[PDB]
Design a binder for this molecule. Structure first.
Ligand SMILES: O=c1ccn([C@@H]2O[C@H](COP(=O)(O)OP(=O)(O)OP(=O)(O)O)[C@@H](O)[C@H]2O)c(=O)[nH]1
Length: 282
């Protein structure tokens, strides 16, 4: 049917960004002036998703207070007639967008984080969006994928072409190329050595999953691997890999985070020009 829900796992330990992540999850890191998780939610909104499910771990309130109403900030902005900033703050969570929270008690990995959201997804297809993967696309990547899902009504795994030497960092898909950008998947293999990688198509943190993924998650022998659930699912039904149009910034790591900051600052209306001039003359 329709993709109304997006699950955002934001419960990782984020040790690669200590000390900043001590009391704020990695997905709250700002790129210029905006947390990763807000970029991710805005992508979901652009895709027609209206229900945001956050799987929280440590520092859940950074996520919750970012999206929930804050009386203090509005009373502060109200008391100063700063109306454009008020519209900006309110657009963090537009009307008709709902935020639900669920706890992952133990940082038992991504597949387990997804499993924590099972009762909230129930018997519906749902997006899984990893805000650490900051995707820059027009149209937004999850919107592209929702269009793919609406056509084929199969799970959709976002993929990008990666250097063959780097396959050990990625889930790698295999299958029959269907369109220029659609692979009908025959396999997904977790972090293969370059010489045995079945393709150069690496999985990124964008998924549309049909609810049968949950029975394969609960069934796995435990850190449950999302890859293994996907591999199991494609034995029972079509799963598609989608070579999205756009650019991924691996903000799980410091370098991708920095690249994202640079690239997004350059396209920022307020500071783009000066930051470009600064970069040239430094
Ligand atoms: O227990 C977990 C682990 C990971 N995740 C989620 O899975 C995705 C991938 O996150 P990772 O598993 O790569 O962990 P991390 O980047 O937070 O950890 P460090 O390497 O910085 O130590 C992110 O969306 C994260 O929030 C969970 O929700 N729960």
């Amino acid at each position: 049917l329709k993709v109304n829900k997006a699950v955002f796992p934001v419960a990782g330990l984020g040790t690669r960004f200590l000390p900043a992540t001590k009391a704020s999850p990695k997905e709250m890191l700002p790129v210029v002036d905006k947390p990763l998780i807000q970029y991710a939610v805005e992508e979901a909104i652009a895709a027609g998703i209206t229900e945001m499910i956050f799987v929280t771990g440590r520092s859940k309130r950074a996520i919750e207070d970012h999206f929930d109403k804050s009386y203090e900030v509005e009373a502060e902005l109200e008391a100063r007639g700063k109306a454009k900033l008020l519209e900006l703050v309110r657009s963090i969570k537009p009307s008709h967008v709902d935020c639900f929270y669920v706890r992952q008690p133990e940082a038992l990995g991504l597949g387990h984080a997804v499993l924590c959201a099972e009762k909230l997804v129930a018997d519906n297809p749902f997006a899984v969006i990893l805000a650490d993967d900051l995707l820059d696309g027009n149209p937004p990547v999850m919107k592209q994928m929702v269009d793919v899902f609406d056509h084929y009504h199969s799970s959709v795994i976002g993929v990008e072409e990666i250097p063959p030497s780097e396959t050990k960092s990625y889930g790698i898909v295999d299958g029959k190329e269907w369109e220029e950008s659609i692979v009908k998947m025959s396999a997904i293999v977790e972090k293969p050595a370059p010489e045995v990688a079945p393709s150069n198509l690496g999985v990124v943190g964008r998924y549309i999953l049909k609810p049968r993924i949950f029975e394969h998650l609960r069934a796995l022998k435990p850190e449950l691997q999302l890859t293994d659930a996907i591999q199991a699912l494609l034995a029972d039904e079509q799963v598609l890999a989608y070579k999205y149009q756009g650019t991924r910034y691996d903000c799980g790591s410091k370098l991708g985070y920095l690249k994202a900051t640079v690239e997004f600052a350059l396209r920022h209306p307020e500071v783009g020009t000066e930051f470009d001039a600064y970069l040239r003359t430094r």
